[PDB]
Design a protein around this ligand. Structure first.
Ligand SMILES: [Cl-]
Ligand SMILES: [Cl-]
Ligand SMILES: [Cl-]
Length: 75
């Protein structure tokens, strides 16, 4: 259950607290192209990093996460 955003793969998790988005990264923390969206969805054993203002090692991460949350309303 991953979608494409800014050429990145994002998933969503929730509970009784809130909905958080997480991005799929390779073992170097480089996000995985949308050109591999099919394998990621079939073989879902990938590194995932939750959206967080404090995570700094992915450029434009805050913008891609905002987009992901937006796309849950303005589809
Ligand atoms: Cl790698
Ligand atoms: Cl940003
Ligand atoms: Cl930037």
């Amino acid at each position: 259950n991953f979608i494409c955003v800014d050429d990145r793969l994002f998933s969503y998790n929730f509970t009784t607290s809130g909905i958080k988005a997480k991005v799929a990264v390779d073992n170097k923390n480089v996000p995985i192209p949308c050109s591999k969206i099919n394998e990621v969805n079939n073989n879902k054993d990938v590194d995932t990093l939750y959206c967080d203002k404090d995570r700094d090692d992915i450029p434009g991460f805050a913008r891609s996460c905002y987009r992901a949350y937006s796309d849950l309303f303005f589809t």
